[PDB]
Amino acid sequence: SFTMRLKELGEFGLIDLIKKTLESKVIGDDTAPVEYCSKKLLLTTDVLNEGVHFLRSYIPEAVGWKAISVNVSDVIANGGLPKWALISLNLPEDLEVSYVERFYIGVKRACEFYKCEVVGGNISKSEKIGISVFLVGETERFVGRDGARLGDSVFVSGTLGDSRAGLELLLMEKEEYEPFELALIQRHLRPTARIDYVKHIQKYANASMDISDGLVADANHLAQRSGVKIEILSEKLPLSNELKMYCEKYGKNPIEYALFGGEDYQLLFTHPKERWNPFLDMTEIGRVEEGEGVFVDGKKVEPKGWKHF
Amino acid sequence: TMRLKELGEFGLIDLIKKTLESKVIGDDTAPVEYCSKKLLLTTDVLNEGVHFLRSYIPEAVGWKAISVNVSDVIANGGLPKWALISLNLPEDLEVSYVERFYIGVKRACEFYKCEVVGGNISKSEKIGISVFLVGETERFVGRDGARLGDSVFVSGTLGDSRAGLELLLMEKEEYEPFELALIQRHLRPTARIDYVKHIQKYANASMDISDGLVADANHLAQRSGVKIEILSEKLPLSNELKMYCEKYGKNPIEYALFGGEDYQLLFTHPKERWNPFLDMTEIGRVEEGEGVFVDGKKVEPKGWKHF
Numbered sequence: 001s002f003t004m005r006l007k008e009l010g011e012f013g014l015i016d017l018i019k020k021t022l023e024s025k026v027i028g029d030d031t032a033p034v035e036y037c038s039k040k041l042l043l044t045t046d047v048l049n050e051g052v053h054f055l056r057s058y059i060p061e062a063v064g065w066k067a068i069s070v071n072v073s074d075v076i077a078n079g080g081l082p083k084w085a086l087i088s089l090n091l092p093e094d095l096e097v098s099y100v101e102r103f104y105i106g107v108k109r110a111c112e113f114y115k116c117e118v119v120g121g122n123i124s125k126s127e128k129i130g131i132s133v134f135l136v137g138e139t140e141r142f143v144g145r146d147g148a149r150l151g152d153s154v155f156v157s158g159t160l161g162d163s164r165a166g167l168e169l170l171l172m173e174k175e176e177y178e179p180f181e182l183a184l185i186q187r188h189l190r191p192t193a194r195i196d197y198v199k200h201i202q203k204y205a206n207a208s209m210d211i212s213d214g215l216v217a218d219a220n221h222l223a224q225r226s227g228v229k230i231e232i233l234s235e236k237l238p239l240s241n242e243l244k245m246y247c248e249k250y251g252k253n254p255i256e257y258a259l260f261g262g263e264d265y266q267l268l269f270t271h272p273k274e275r276w277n278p279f280l281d282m283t284e285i286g287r288v289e290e291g292e293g294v295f296v297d298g299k300k301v302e303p304k305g306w307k308h309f
Numbered sequence: 310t311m312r313l314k315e316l317g318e319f320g321l322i323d324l325i326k327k328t329l330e331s332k333v334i335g336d337d338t339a340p341v342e343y344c345s346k347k348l349l350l351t352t353d354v355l356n357e358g359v360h361f362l363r364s365y366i367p368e369a370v371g372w373k374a375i376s377v378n379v380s381d382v383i384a385n386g387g388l389p390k391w392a393l394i395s396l397n398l399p400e401d402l403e404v405s406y407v408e409r410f411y412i413g414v415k416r417a418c419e420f421y422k423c424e425v426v427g428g429n430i431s432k433s434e435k436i437g438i439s440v441f442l443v444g445e446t447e448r449f450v451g452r453d454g455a456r457l458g459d460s461v462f463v464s465g466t467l468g469d470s471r472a473g474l475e476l477l478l479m480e481k482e483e484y485e486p487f488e489l490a491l492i493q494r495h496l497r498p499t500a501r502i503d504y505v506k507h508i509q510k511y512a513n514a515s516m517d518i519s520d521g522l523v524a525d526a527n528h529l530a531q532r533s534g535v536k537i538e539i540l541s542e543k544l545p546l547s548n549e550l551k552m553y554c555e556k557y558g559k560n561p562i563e564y565a566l567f568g569g570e571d572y573q574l575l576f577t578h579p580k581e582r583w584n585p586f587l588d589m590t591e592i593g594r595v596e597e598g599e600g601v602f603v604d605g606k607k608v609e610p611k612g613w614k615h616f
């Protein structure tokens with residue numbers, strides 16, 4: 001047999017093939033805009049698979065919180081507010097009910113914090129834990145990742161690389177972790193969607209999305225969709241103290257974690273610096289110019305990222 | 310230490326409802342108020358080795374993915390509008406499989422009149438298809454409003470999907486014309502979007518028969534607080550089923566009451582409200598308080614349980 005597999009096709013070839021097979025024009029952003037009653041509902045889905053996004057050994061509460069968060073992150077990144085959610089679960093017959101009870105308590109906590117509601121879902125048995133959450137968002141103004149203008153400044157929220165450091169910390173399987181380390185582990189396990197940026201993005205963002213697979217990588221989605229070149233400056237990337245602590249203590253380059261670190265779930269949006277709002281952890285990292293691709297310090301850059309295939 | 314298999318499917322739903330302190334959870338769709346009318350939210354999953362096999366024709370699976378979920382929307386008087394697809398795919402799955410799957414999905418959407426606007430992807434060891442569907446209705450019809458004196462109706466025929474399944478599991482060299490018909494009804498269910506209007510106007514309670522009549526009748530019985538009386542001799546049996554039952558020495562009634570995945574509707578309303586143009590069949594009547602009985606006796610459900 002010589003017929004092509006997904007491994008050979010790659011995630012981006014897969015995505016393009018589905019879009020083309022569906023002949024859909026509404027698709028390529030973090031959510032799917034859909035007009036309704038003059039307003040625009042934002043639809044999005046996300047999965048967390050055991051062994052792929054988390055391990056059964058993790059604290060279920062954190063996974064339930066995260067299952068909602070990463071999804072709220074997509075709704076927020078396009079300028080919308082989370083409303084209703086559905087959860088589709090693949091659970092092994094031998095799973096502890098306490099794991100599921102606790103998981104949902106994490107779900108409840110997140111929804112109460114993001115102010116959305118889990119109105120239903122689905123159950124099915126399976127070999128391993130599968131968590132698929134669907135989210136419905138409401139928004140006055142949709143903000144894709146294609147409207148970036150030239151000259152615009154490139155801003156990110158929070159700090160980067162923390163999550164990748166937290167994941168490596170989790171893999172060490174230590175019995176005890178130092179306070180700064182738990183902070184990082186914290187960011188990987190219970191990420192928090194920047195739902196506090198809705199107002200801002202929805203009003204002053206020309207283009208926006210959330211960093212989920214790594215800055216450099218997702219930056220390419222932005223550049224491509226909009227049709228510009230992304231000029232990023234490493235020594236302007238918001239780094240974390242605990243991240244620097246982890247890097248000092250373990251011998252790694254912080255920059256390396258901020259450019260190619262995943263699951264940070266911060267935002268990536270562009271707009272005129274004249275629209276900057278100092279009352280938010282906003283951090284300009286680069287500029288939108290003519291050309292194509294993403295340049296870190298005026299250079300190539302692989303890039304590296306997550307990619308399932 | 311307590312596992313999911315010991316809790317049971319109803320127990321797991323119960324626990325989730327209580328833990329989420331939810332009011333909406335309870336029937337086929339999730340009724341949501343949004344600008345005059347209500348939106349209907351629902352999701353269904355197809356897992357490899359659980360709902361289908363990798364050998365099955367991929368376009369049929371794509372179709373079923375959409376149908377099974379439309380079935381829940383229709384079942385509550387709504388119409389399909391937007392769908393999202395979350396896929397778990399093994400790195401070795403052939404590209405043609407995903408392409409053919411999306412063809413069956415493409416045309417399922419053209420048939421039901423809904424568009425797929427996005428979804429998700431992830432590496433995985435087994436194919437997993439989680440569909441999210443958003444539909445809309447002018448009048449939500451759940452499964453708690455059955456009135457005493459209402460007549461109990463189902464659409465099409467029952468027990469076909471289970472037989473089609475069994476035929477597939479036999480892995481015969483080749484099948485008879487009728488065995489292909491049954492295998493088809495199992496591989497390619499067809500949501501009853503042609504009943505939307507009848508449910509929306511005249512049904513008091515409604516739902517689709519995904520796990521089996523007797524088992525799903527309970528949800529309705531329990532949800533409406535009534536007692537559902539069913540008569541086996543009134544259950545609609547297709548000709549292909551009778552032919553299959555005859556040939557393998559099986560009782561058609563057993564397949565009608567416990568056969569799953571037929572995706573027909575089960576709804577109640579005054580007998581007079583009966584619409585002869587659609588293929589509905591009265592099978593029982595709504596009596597007073599608790600239970601689901603068949604020919605007098607209170608048969609114990611044998612529907613498909615996940616736990």
Ligand SMILES: Nc1ncnc2c1ncn2[C@@H]1O[C@H](COP(=O)(O)OP(=O)(O)CP(=O)(O)O)[C@@H](O)[C@H]1O
Nearest residue numbers: 087089119120121122123334335336337338519528
């Ligand atoms: N993991 C989950 N999280 C939240 N709600 C869930 C859920 N799994 C199931 N539910 C909800 O519980 C209710 C019903 O389960 P029930 O088994 O009677 O039917 P169903 O509507 O799920 C169709 P089917 O059973 O054929 O897949 C639904 O209203 C659904 O939204």
Ligand SMILES: Nc1ncnc2c1ncn2[C@@H]1O[C@H](COP(=O)(O)OP(=O)(O)CP(=O)(O)O)[C@@H](O)[C@H]1O
Nearest residue numbers: 018027028029030031212394396426427428429430
């Ligand atoms: N199986 C599938 N079917 C249909 N659309 C899909 C899909 N998998 C992904 N998509 C769609 O393709 C587009 C984007 O993929 P992209 O990888 O850039 O981001 P994402 O929105 O999926 C968020 P993240 O990667 O952080 O989960 C989206 O508009 C999404 O709806």
Ligand SMILES: Cc1ncc(C[n+]2csc(CCOP(=O)(O)O)c2C)c(N)n1
Nearest residue numbers: 047051052053054055212213262263306
């Ligand atoms: C067990 C385990 N191994 C590795 C990682 C790293 N990781 C996995 S998926 C992902 C991006 C997810 O988003 P999406 O699903 O949208 O691709 C990242 C950074 C992890 N979290 N857990």
Ligand SMILES: Cc1ncc(C[n+]2csc(CCOP(=O)(O)O)c2C)c(N)n1
Nearest residue numbers: 124354358359360361519520569570613
């Ligand atoms: C390999 C294999 N073994 C058995 C069956 C039968 N079956 C599985 S799930 C189900 C109900 C599904 O709806 P839900 O997922 O809502 O429970 C039925 C009738 C099958 N299709 N494939």
Ligand SMILES: [Mg+2]
Nearest residue numbers: 030074210212
């Ligand atoms: Mg994203």
Ligand SMILES: [Mg+2]
Nearest residue numbers: 046047429430
């Ligand atoms: Mg995802």
Ligand SMILES: [Mg+2]
Nearest residue numbers: 046070074212
């Ligand atoms: Mg996402």
Ligand SMILES: [Mg+2]
Nearest residue numbers: 212213306307
């Ligand atoms: Mg990704």
Ligand SMILES: [Mg+2]
Nearest residue numbers: 213217218221
């Ligand atoms: Mg990406």
Ligand SMILES: [Mg+2]
Nearest residue numbers: 337381517519
């Ligand atoms: Mg149902």
Ligand SMILES: [Mg+2]
Nearest residue numbers: 122352353354
């Ligand atoms: Mg289901």
Ligand SMILES: [Mg+2]
Nearest residue numbers: 353377381519
């Ligand atoms: Mg269903």
Ligand SMILES: [Mg+2]
Nearest residue numbers: 519520613615
């Ligand atoms: Mg079921």
Ligand SMILES: [Mg+2]
Nearest residue numbers: 520524525528
């Ligand atoms: Mg059921």
